[PDB]
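For reproducibility, we list the full input for the 7NQ complex.
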Amino acid sequence: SLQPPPQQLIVQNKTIDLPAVYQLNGGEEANPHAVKVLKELLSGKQSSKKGMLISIGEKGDKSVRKYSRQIPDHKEGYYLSVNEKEIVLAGNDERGTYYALQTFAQLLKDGKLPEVEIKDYPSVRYRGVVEGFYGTPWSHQARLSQLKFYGKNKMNTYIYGPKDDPYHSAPNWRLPYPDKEAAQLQELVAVANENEVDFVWAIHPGQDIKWNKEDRDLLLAKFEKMYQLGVRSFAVFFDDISGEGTNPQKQAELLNYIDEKFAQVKPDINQLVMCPTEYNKSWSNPNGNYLTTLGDKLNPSIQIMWTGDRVISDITRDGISWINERIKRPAYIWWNFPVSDYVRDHLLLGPVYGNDTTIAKEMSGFVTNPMEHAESSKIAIYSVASYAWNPAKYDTWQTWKDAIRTILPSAAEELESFAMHNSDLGPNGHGYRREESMDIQPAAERFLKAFKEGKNYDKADFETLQYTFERMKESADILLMNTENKPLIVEITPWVHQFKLTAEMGEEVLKMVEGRNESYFLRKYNHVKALQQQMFYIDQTSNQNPCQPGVKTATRVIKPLIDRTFATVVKFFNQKFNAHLDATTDYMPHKMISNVIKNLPLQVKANRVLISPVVKWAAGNSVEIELDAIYPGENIQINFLEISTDGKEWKTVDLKQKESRLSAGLQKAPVKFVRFTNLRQFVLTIEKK
Ligand SMILES: *CCC(=O)Nc1nc(OCC)c2ccccc2n1
Ligand SMILES: [Ca+2]
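The corresponding predicted structure, in tokenized form, follows.
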């Protein structure tokens, strides 16, 4: 599967050997980055004045003069030909030549090539990745790896804008990078250039920019320092800010000044891009002219970015028509997937889909905002590269599989098994979801209805569930030990552990359903309870980020199936044997009781213990939380109060107020019980770890 698939391809059912003796024409006149690829591929073979002719060059070079009519007249276009007589690798321009060699490399298998003729070019002018997320920015080693990946997949754009880089954003955007970081950035630029990628350095100054001479000049001096490090494309982002920096006329004037005084004065600046403050339809003022002001005032060579109809959105024909009318140019898409920076407890390893495949002419560019997990994001990146190059031939499912096979050839089926059940976001404030576990969902839902009611489930369905859990454990164990992509495995490991425990829990729960005798059932029950505790421990000790800590996996179908089946089989057991087994599905070491609320589960997040968010609260009614030990208390925050260490001797804590927010410091007071007498928020913070 050539990826991206070329615009035009004609294959014969005929094969030639990569020639043992070859005559190279154009080695000194073609793109040296393409020539390097070709020479690596011909490493074994003999350069002669006789032997099979291989011609490499750009249109205008002597080497490819015979083939000038076959070369597409498109930016980054190429013509590739292999037949028994000769090989031709001819770009319309130097990057096109490089791209011809990336296609050529995929054609070559077991020292053999198909007889083929290809004419190829990208449908979208700028294709790539915006490292534009909140969280731990990609490591330098991760970035190196990404740039090589981009060249292989014909992505020509890498926009550097990690929100947590203080020399990119708040507070130190005005300052030059310190020496260590500057040398790293210089190396990234060099490697980008070697992989035919434009390194676009972005700046995000808007939260405290002053519309005065001093800050204008400081921005330009920072761009100049980045130009000294080799940067030749630049962006200015005004997303996710408030205040004076949101002014569109001033934004447009700044970008125009950058254009006039910098981008028009250097010999070799390529992209100049801005991200607006109103960067999706839902954030656009209905009766405001923010977007029309940018559209009319911004110099027409300057690109304008757009995330779609919402912050997290798929791009439609109606949506892109809507923006294009107002900005007076084709939008440069900023696609917010697989970015997980608002659902940091989930990996998003599913296919890329949802974007209209007929709107290439309506977009200037398409870049993906990835996860902070760089290797894991390659699944989606590979897919976006395929989409943006040839959207008319974009096959979501086959591209997903191809990506996985590319990224982890040694354990591709195991990675697919894992990714199939790690693709949904769970519930979130952006409303954005993806499909997950679709294949087993029918068997899961049939089984669970039959089970709940008074019905024999289908043996096949039970077996499909067993098969799934068995395969999950195989995939987890194989992935954990895989050393072909060690950085990938480091990223996903906490989720792999959680996924394996999920599968184990599933297996034990099905053994509870198979219901042979009382003492066996209880053994399975006790084992499930232990596995629940293990899953709680992973959740509290892994991926303890400040936003959405912990580790969730197989959340759409699998975990709900297991949890519902467990609750049901425990209910039946209690009914049948007059027992009182606990039917709770998530382990929770702390306890809460209430007359009101009563069945809202407690959560533990970092050093917070909280009740899960109209409630009718009678007089003298109370909520009581018992912790599992005595801890020093930090504070209590409540949004519509006593503490103790033994439950008997109490002490009152007076809440302060500002709007609906109630709060009180506890000054390290020992706390085991918290009681309120007479909910968007109920959170105790303790001293932990
Ligand atoms: C958990 C991290 C988080 O919420 N990050 C975040 N930060 C900012 O502000 C940058 C200082 C932000 C602004 C607007 C929208 C979302 C945001 N998320
Ligand atoms: Ca040339």
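The chain has three domains: 1-121, 122-407, 408-689. The domain at 408-689 is CATH 1.20.58.460 (Methane Monooxygenase Hydroxylase; Chain G, domain 1). Both points were considered when choosing residues for closer inspection.
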